[PDB]
Structure 1
Amino acid sequence: DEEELNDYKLRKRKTFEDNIRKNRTVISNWIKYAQWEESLKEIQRARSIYERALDVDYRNITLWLKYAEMEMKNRQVNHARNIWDRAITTLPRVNQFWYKYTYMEEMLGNVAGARQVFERWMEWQPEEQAWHSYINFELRYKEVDRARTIYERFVLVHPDVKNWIKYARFEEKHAYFAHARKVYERAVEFFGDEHMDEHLYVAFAKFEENQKEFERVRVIYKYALDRAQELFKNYTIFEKK
């Protein structure tokens, strides 16, 4: 049955090569050919198929994802790290490659060098989900001052009132009440100080209600002086408290 399996593999490989020569652009023949080689346990041949598919077209996300996934499912963990390094250095603007490489090298790898790589992506300045995931990975590595610096970098890169309120809440939860009050003061004086949205002022009033409520009454009075109905309700709550 070995020669029959060889003849079947020759016929299937010939039909796969015929589909490739009919349509080199269609990557489904390449993907099914590589998974057929993986099912036939020709891992290096499937790696060659994935490499020629990337040579024909390196711009597909799913080719890198599939070849990294089969290298991770096999014993090619270092080869998967090579795949992720090439995918990052060719496509630094693809968020899923960053997320999946840091998840793989944080769960299977457990590498803080992957966190340094993800901080290199923080120097590529992503959206807020990636900054919050680096904050959460610093908390999972149990360094609250690191996550405070990451959130300060996020407030520097993408400044927002919600970002500064999250920084104040993170400094409050990281057992730094003075740093939380300083973050609330910097949110009042920096995050939309000319805008005067009276939301960072409300967060500073909540932080001063956590710390010492006379400062909460002063902050609510200052917000009602700077501002509407919400500021009037905050001043009335500070007067009734």
Structure 2
Amino acid sequence: KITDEEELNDYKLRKRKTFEDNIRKNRTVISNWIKYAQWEESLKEIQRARSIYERALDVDYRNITLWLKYAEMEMKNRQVNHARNIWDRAITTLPRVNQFWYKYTYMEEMLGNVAGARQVFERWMEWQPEEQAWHSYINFELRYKEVDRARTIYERFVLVHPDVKNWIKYARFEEKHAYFAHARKVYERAVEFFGDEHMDEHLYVAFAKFEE
């Protein structure tokens, strides 16, 4: 056990020079950088942690574990606004990595900033990401009521991903919430959109189920 000031400071020095020589030694694999920053955070010296993460991102910024460990460290230590700036830089420079958008939105929801979460979801959808992202957005709109927003999203969605399956899901959505006239309009729009030259079973099956 470390009595006090000078002995734990020597302990700091020894571990610290060990880390820094590892980094000088390889300067690559980020297991070293992360071990180091994890330690300097465990001692609650987080300005050193921030410097370490920044230097690491200077080495290799395309590495997503680095960004995630970093924003996690900021978030635990309640540095909310630091975490926001980090998520923003991350989704700016690596916009295809979906984890970043997911976790940024999830945080902003926890924190109670629903306006913020919608801002982020909108920015995300600008990239025309993937079905799962659109679903996540709609589910977000559905944990709150806001069903009109949900159908606006669905309008953009079925255009961005024109698959029969999505048209089906859209119709199913509106019927589950009992907008039967609108679901009929959905189905007629679906048929007239797809056209004969492609048109096959699944769509008609669901259309028959509805009208049945």
Say which SS state the counterpart of residue 85 (structure 2) adopts. Answer: helix
Aligned residues: 209
Of 166, 169, 174, which residue of structure 1 is paired with 2:172? 169
Matched-pair contact (CA < 8 Å) for 1:84–1:101? yes
> More displaced, 56-65 or 187-196?
187-196
- Could you list the per-position Cα deviations for residues 65-102 of structure 1 after superposition, in whole angstroms to 9, with x for gaps in the alignment? 00100111111111001000000111111101001111
Say which SS state the counterpart of residue 159 (structure 1) adopts. Answer: coil
Say which SS state the counterpart of residue 8 (structure 2) adopts. Answer: helix
Matched-pair contact (CA < 8 Å) for 1:191–1:200? no
**1:141 CA displacement:** 2.3
CA RMSD of aligned residues (A): 1.2
Of 4, 10, 35, which residue of structure 1 is paired with 2:13? 10
Distance 1:23 1:192, change over 3 A: farther
- Could you list the per-position Cα deviations for residues 112-163 of structure 1 after superposition, in whole angstroms to 9, with x for gaps in the alignment? 2222211221110111111111111111121111111111111001111110
Alignment-derived partner of residue 25 in structure 1: 28
Q: How does 1:91-170 map to 2 (within 5 A)?
A: 91-170=94-173
- Could you list the per-position Cα deviations for residues 187-241 of structure 1 after superposition, in whole angstroms to 9, with x for gaps in the alignment? 22213542120221222212212xxxxxxxxxxxxxxxxxxxxxxxxxxxxxxxx
Q: Within 2, Cα distance between the matches of 1:39 and 1:166?
A: 47
Q: Within 2, Cα distance between the matches of 1:125 and 1:196?
A: 25
Q: TM-score, normalised by structure 2?
A: 0.94
Matched-pair contact (CA < 8 Å) for 1:184–1:203? no
Distance 1:104 1:135, change over 3 A: same
Say which SS state the counterpart of residue 132 (structure 1) adopts. Answer: helix
- Could you list the per-position Cα deviations for residues 10-54 of structure 1 after superposition, in whole angstroms to 9, with x for gaps in the alignment? 011001110010010121111011011011110111011101111
Matched-pair contact (CA < 8 Å) for 1:34–1:46? yes
Structure ranking higher on relative contact order (CA contacts 8 Å, 6+ apart):
2
Q: Within 2, Cα distance between the matches of 1:132 and 1:20?
A: 42
- Runs of 4+ in structure 1 displaced over 4 angstroms? none
Distance 1:193 1:131, change over 3 A: farther
**Larger-Rg structure:** 1
Q: TM-score, normalised by structure 1?
A: 0.83
Matched-pair contact (CA < 8 Å) for 1:106–1:114? yes
Say which SS state the counterpart of residue 41 (structure 1) adopts. Answer: coil
